[PDB]
Amino acid sequence: ADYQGKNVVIIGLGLTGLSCVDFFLARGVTPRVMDTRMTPPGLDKLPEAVERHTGSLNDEWLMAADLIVASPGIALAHPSLSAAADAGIEIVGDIELFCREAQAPIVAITGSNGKSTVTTLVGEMAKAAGVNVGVGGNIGLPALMLLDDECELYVLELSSFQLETTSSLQAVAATILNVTEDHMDRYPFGLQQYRAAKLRIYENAKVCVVNADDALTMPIRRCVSFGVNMGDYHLNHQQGETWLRVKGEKVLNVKEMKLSGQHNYTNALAALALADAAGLPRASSLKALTTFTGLPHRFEVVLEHNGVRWINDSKATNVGSTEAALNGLHVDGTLHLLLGGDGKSADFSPLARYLNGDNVRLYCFGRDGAQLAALRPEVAEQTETMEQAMRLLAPRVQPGDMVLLSPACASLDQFKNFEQRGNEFARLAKELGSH
Numbered sequence: 389a390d391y392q393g394k395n396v397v398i399i400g401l402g403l404t405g406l407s408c409v410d411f412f413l414a415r416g417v418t419p420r421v422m423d424t425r426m427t428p429p430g431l432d433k434l435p436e437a438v439e440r441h442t443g444s445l446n447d448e449w450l451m452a453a454d455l456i457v458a459s460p461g462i463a464l465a466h467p468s469l470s471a472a473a474d475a476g477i478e479i480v481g482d483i484e485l486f487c488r489e490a491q492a493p494i495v496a497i498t499g500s501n502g503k504s505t506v507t508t509l510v511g512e513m514a515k516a517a518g519v520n521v522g523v524g525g526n527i528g529l530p531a532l533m534l535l536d537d538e539c540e541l542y543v544l545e546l547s548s549f550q551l552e553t554t555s556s557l558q559a560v561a562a563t564i565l566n567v568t569e570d571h572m573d574r575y576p577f578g579l580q581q582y583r584a585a586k587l588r589i590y591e592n593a594k595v596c597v598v599n600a601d602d603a604l605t606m607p608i609r610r611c612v613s614f615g616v617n618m619g620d621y622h623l624n625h626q627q628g629e630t631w632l633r634v635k636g637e638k639v640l641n642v643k644e645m646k647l648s649g650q651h652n653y654t655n656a657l658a659a660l661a662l663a664d665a666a667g668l669p670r671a672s673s674l675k676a677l678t679t680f681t682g683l684p685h686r687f688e689v690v691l692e693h694n695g696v697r698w699i700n701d702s703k704a705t706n707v708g709s710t711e712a713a714l715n716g717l718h719v720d721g722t723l724h725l726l727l728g729g730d731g732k733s734a735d736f737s738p739l740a741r742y743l744n745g746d747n748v749r750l751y752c753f754g755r756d757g758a759q760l761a762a763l764r765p766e767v768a769e770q771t772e773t774m775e776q777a778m779r780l781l782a783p784r785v786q787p788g789d790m791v792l793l794s795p796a797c798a799s800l801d802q803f804k805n806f807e808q809r810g811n812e813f814a815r816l817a818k819e820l821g822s823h
């Protein structure tokens with residue numbers, strides 16, 4: 389693509405918006421930047437040569453543009469963006485710009501849960517094969533910063549939002565891992581609209597990898613599949629042993645993995661299917677499965693001390709993710725479960741089946757704390773903040789207990805992101821969980 393001489397407007401700054409600014413400048417195009425936040429993240433790092441408008445969108449600049457580059461954090465349905473689309477002004481995102489330039493195959497991964505873990509795993513599979521791999525696409529690692537003529541493979545975690553503005557992806561292997569209700573605040577036509585955004589990932593993909601146990605991951609109209617009992621890649625349970633299998637052949641006894649639990653086992657299957665389709669050697673891919681230790685904020689044990697395990701699962705930002713942490717969970721004594729934040733209009737009721745019995749306490753906070761408490765008011769406390777919740781529950785904690793942050797909500801009402809929320813939990817857990 390050739391951007392020379394174009395009037396380019398970037399909407400949304402932060403690290404990703406900055407990556408877009410730098411992309412155009414390096415190509416001899418000076419873009420303009422706008423952000424509805426008065427002082428968005430990264431403002432101080434924008435060069436002074438770049439004109440910017442903050443605190444609102446500027447329709448004069450939008451309607452004059454030849455190309456709009458929209459952050460995934462701004463809805464395409466925003467009136468100012470829809471007016472530009474109606475006028476025939478091209479709108480893309482950073483991932484689109486990346487796909488137009490990439491000179492290595494792309495493995496593309498989305499889904500409501502698991503997409504970071506799968507993306508990181510396939511990255512480790514590539515490294516174990518000695519392939520020069522670029523891994524990113526999420527908040528901390530903008531895709532455009534990965535671009536490098538020496539890269540031999542890219543592995544991208546993509547959100548529904550990024551996919552909405554992407555049209556040139558031709559993934560060597562693409563997956564939707566699962567679709568469970570999330571981001572309803574951005575999808576006013578409901579679950580099927582959210583699904584449709586994710587289905588975009590399979591367009592022009594060489595291999596599609598679907599979840600045999602989740603029909604919403606399947607194109608609406610020859611995909612490779614993974615599942616628990618069913619699928620080209622599936623699990624084989626005999627004795628107390630679990631195996632990863634491909635078409636009936638055993639490939640790995642999961643005792644060799646550091647990760648544990650059924651959803652980690654299906655994540656490993658999806659990652660193997662992707663790696664296989666991308667041409668990576670199977671034997672090195674299996675090696676990577678044995679060495680991978682998990683991501684921070686993903687059911688991460690931050691302290692095990694005095695008979696109590698404190699678990700940071702701050703990356704549980706929707707109901708399906710919390711349900712994965714609770715489903716099959718073993719607790720010797722009482723589970724003290726922290727819920728709260730911006731629930732984005734989600735139906736929390738699917739959590740209710742996990743919350744019966746004498747050994748559960750809920751500590752609910754943030755924007756939607758009252759609705760979370762209402763799942764079972766007799767075992768629930770509500771506070772404004774997570775720190776208040778933590779200081780309220782810590783005196784009640786007994787040897788045998790588990791304290792679990794798995795909030796089912798975004799952190800954005802009170803924190804910069806789920807990583808800051810996790811880090812604060814870990815700090816308080818270390819404070820409160822010893823003498």
Ligand SMILES: O=C(O)CC[C@@H](NC(=O)c1cccc(NCc2ccc(/C=C3\SC(=S)NC3=O)cc2)c1)C(=O)O
Nearest residue numbers: 399400423424425459460461462705798799800805806
């Ligand atoms: O961290 C959490 O707790 C939420 C996790 C959960 N994040 C998002 O829903 C999400 C969606 C899109 C973007 C970002 N992260 C970067 C970003 C954050 C805020 C903005 C806000 C903008 S842009 C603009 S113009 N005006 C704004 O307010 C833009 C980009 C986050 C997810 O990954 O599922």
